[PDB]
Symmetry: C2
Subunit: 210 residues, 2 copies
């Protein structure tokens, strides 16, 4: 009985149903093959591995597994699969072919924190570029202060392990962009905005700041 970022995301794990047709990629940014690799190979493997480890978590959220395994050395393998499952699921919810325009509520909140949407985007791209190795770049709500914050994590790291509430993420594991952008992570992050589902981000913002 507490807030979850994705309360519908539960164990036994399942690859999530995408808001759109997989075979089309996520135009204009991600090709069909880039999405197929990422979703049908990478994400699918985390779902499959997690299902060999999570006995006892039936009916519970994936976030509950993350929170029960975080910082525990003997549980690193399960933590990594559960967090990656959650991280990818959340990522797909953040995206849509051609994007969705940012509602006024969200625009105001982003400008109130960062000065403008443009200044937030510049800062967000920079944090993603600078995230050494594999990981994720996040926009989160701090529920105590109501601040919006950019946070980067390494590998399977997830800001909800520190009590932050994600509202947007960009995967910056090299596999997220290597098929279409090769080494060009900066270009990937700049182009990614064209496919962000800002309606989902705004929905997350409203519930996270309540």
């Amino acid at each position: 009985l507490c807030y979850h970022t994705l309360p519908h995301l539960r164990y036994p794990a399942e690859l999530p149903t995408l808001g759109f047709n997989y075979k089309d990629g996520i135009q204009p940014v991600m090709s069909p093959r880039q999405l197929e690799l990422h979703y049908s190979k990478h994400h699918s493997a985390y779902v499959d591995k997690l299902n060999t480890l999570g006995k006892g978590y039936e009916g519970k959220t994936i976030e509950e597994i993350i929170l029960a395994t975080t910082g525990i050395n003997e549980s690193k393998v399960m933590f990594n699969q559960a967090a990656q499952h959650f991280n990818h699921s959340f990522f797909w919810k953040c995206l849509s072919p051609g994007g969705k325009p940012m509602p006024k509520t969200l625009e105001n909140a982003i400008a109130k924190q960062f000065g403008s949407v443009d200044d937030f985007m510049v800062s967000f791209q920079q944090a993603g570029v600078n995230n050494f190795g594999s990981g994720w770049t996040w926009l989160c709500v701090d529920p105590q202060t109501k601040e919006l914050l950019i946070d980067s994590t390494s590998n399977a790291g997830c800001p909800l392990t520190s009590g932050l509430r994600p509202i947007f993420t960009a995967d910056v594991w090299e596999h997220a962009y290597y098929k279409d952008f090769e080494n060009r992570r900066a270009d990937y992050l700049k182009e990614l905005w064209q496919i962000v589902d800002w309606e989902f981000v705004c929905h997350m913002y409203e519930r996270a700041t309540k």
Copy 2:
């Protein structure tokens, strides 16, 4: 102290490859895979390190790595120097068509691991299981003269724990994604075919002296 690459020095320079960098590393790495890895990834580490290393002129890259390891203020330089060393060492480990394993190294591997095939499977598994970006290494422990498989994350480098590498496989996704996409396991299985075991054996002989 012992250096793995005593000729790899600052100011940093992309190393000359023992082969033509436009022809890839057949039969495993395509020309474009090698061009990206060397001319983009490795090249950016070199360039960035050269913005940071003033004062280290004439020193080994490994001395920079030792001077910056575990120091929070120097994380960025550590990452560049370590990655420059790791990639330069990787390229020496590889050759088109490979080079056959000399008996001395064959015997040492089989003594440590049970057999060469046992070593290879164990090494492949460690690379597959190295979560995220990193490197999987065959090293000599100079305190025992034993061989061991060691995995590192990100720019992590065995020398910071007093180990002497003799072989490494890059398992950053960029090392294999062009030719193998998500198939890291296949990459590691196929990588044996371009391994320069003459260099690996030279390193073994040197590390255990």
